[PDB]
Symmetry: D2
Subunit: 212 residues, 4 copies
Amino acid sequence: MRPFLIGVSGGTASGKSTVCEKIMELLGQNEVEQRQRKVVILSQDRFYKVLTAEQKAKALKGQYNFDHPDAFDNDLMHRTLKNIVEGKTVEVPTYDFVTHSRLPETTVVYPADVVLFEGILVFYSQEIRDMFHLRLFVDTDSDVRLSRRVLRDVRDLEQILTQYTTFVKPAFEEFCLPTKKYADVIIPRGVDNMVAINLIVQHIQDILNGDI
Amino acid sequence: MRPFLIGVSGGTASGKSTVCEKIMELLGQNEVEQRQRKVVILSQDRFYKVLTAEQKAKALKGQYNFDHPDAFDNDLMHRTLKNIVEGKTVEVPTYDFVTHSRLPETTVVYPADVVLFEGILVFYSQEIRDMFHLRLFVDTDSDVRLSRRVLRDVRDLEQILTQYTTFVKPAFEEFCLPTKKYADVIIPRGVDNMVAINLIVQHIQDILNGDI
Amino acid sequence: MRPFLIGVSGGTASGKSTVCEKIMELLGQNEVEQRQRKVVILSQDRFYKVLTAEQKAKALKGQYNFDHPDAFDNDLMHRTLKNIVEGKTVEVPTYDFVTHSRLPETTVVYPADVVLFEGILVFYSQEIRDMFHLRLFVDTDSDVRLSRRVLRDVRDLEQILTQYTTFVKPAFEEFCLPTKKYADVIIPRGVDNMVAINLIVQHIQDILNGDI
Amino acid sequence: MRPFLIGVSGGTASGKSTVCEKIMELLGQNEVEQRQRKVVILSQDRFYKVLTAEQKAKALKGQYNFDHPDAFDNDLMHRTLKNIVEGKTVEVPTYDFVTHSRLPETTVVYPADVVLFEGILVFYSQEIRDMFHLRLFVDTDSDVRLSRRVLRDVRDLEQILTQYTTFVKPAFEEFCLPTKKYADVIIPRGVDNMVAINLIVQHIQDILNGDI
């Protein structure tokens, strides 16, 4: 099928996104302007909702759940994917993590042969789930993920930790972890796993070469 | 590298062996006489030791641990593999599960392009472990495995259960499960996972076609 | 508070019920006619619903889920407990596992000082959950539970296994296991754990002696 | 038996130590000079070895494993306990976490009726293990523990995380977690679990009152 949709899920900082980046790099695709690419990465976090005045006020005081499925603009996500699958050019938002808002300009995604769709909840809903030709889950222990997440989020410590305890952990466990059962292939660790990456890279090259 | 060695581990009745059989079937290799095959399956259980008179007497009374690494003739296993890797013809034993002994005649394995080596402990020792180009682990919950194992072993129930409680479970947990960390790719469920099988089958076909 | 309600949960064959029986035995209460008892055991499985003609027909063909919360007459359970708590005499059904029906005669439970309420789902609903002064969870691995369950259920093997795979396992994981988080005290293994039993038995004796 | 030895284990920041402190507080024992106490807390971390010049140099550069059983002066620990059990006054070291050394002055522990012995590895060796009348394990998820540990250790972030990834996590999993199987009673969460604490506090009061 064209485009071939590969779903990649896992907890935040599992390596789901490092793996996709690594795949693009090894394919040489990251050295090519967006419009000329045959392989594309799509993150679920581009589809976070624009917050209302008061959801925003909850977010500053660390009391808004970004790991609940309702945190995502699912309708937009689904229609975007449904257009990618139909082989069309789509416009895609950019999300500002600091200003919990969606940026003025959109990103243009031209038809690809392969789409890497990554995110914490890309297997949650059956509509999206059934769109994948291959479903990957990057399985990394929570304590390891929290250390990467913590390191990445220092760029306040206490509120990072409080928010993870109250919201991220419970929601990962209720919504994200149960979706592991849909994975075709489980990739442990993340970008460390070069043999796993190469297996997927080789599969993608067969698709691009037309060896299937 | 030639032969390409794929290690497949997991608990007993995980699907590690159903997956290998499925791979051979889809490749068409199971419809070919042993000597003409390019892809071969090798089970670790061909390398169980011949029991002494009294280890045998323990086995009838269900008191012998077949899931401990010492249950395996490791020296023979290692030399056999070391010869397969060197591209040589090897002789391989057949083990009789009922008579806890090794059968009169050996099986001849001719040089293959791909070797699927499956077993509960094929990642336990570093010598063997480092020989694999690809390491797979078929991850299936213990309760599910025990039901398949139980069904397969009825062909006495109470002693099956007692032996699993005393010996199989503890040894799986101490020796086999910790080796999951060496897996490149984790395959959940078993033969149900057609997408996983096909991914590996495609990789093997690239090797046989010389697309790598 | 009088009666003191102790909830004991865990998977089927975890030991939740062996532990309660052991507690009664050590207290000497099992050598006393029902009406004279100060400590009583109440099983959730007395509260299974009477099946309709066609739910019954599903049950014979092994296609009815006895591990779903809807399998239980929750209203009856809740009112019964709400009366026990109010210090009243209650009538309680007996369930026939073979004929998937409720027996002609009820059992009379007279006011107790302590009630041991055991079952797979006694922490599922908040109404019941909040009634417990002490919440125990007997945590035993699924493979171990399945072996006891299998042994107990032979008194057909293949259908036991099929039903456990299709219905018991999924429902234990979705409904029962998540309720572990409500446990005050986790008791590993079951009746093997004499130190745990004795701790609870001593606590119960303090209540009966009026040392609290 | 007098003294009654209660072992409390769990990962670092599990709550094993908050629970003991809470027990002392509720008993009123923390408002009593050391020498007059009937209940005492003993931490395994008082028994860390004095480092050699070069183990110390490894520690500053974050390359020394404080979670390995060899990190502990086991001989001293064992003899100290063996004297406590024999109802004798013992001297006990104080460890300086910053200067990875043992402080000039020792602490005097007078005979107690109850000893709470807490630490990551107090169930590791059978000699010590068999000395406990009651074995508790405070079970708290690694990600939760790491957040408390991280917060407590800021008083450098990157090296805390690197050291936890390289040394703490692997050693917790290899040495500490497997000892959970020896626990009589598992206490989830930590100090949040007031019902669990009170159960143990009541048991201790029965011992002190001579109700057993």
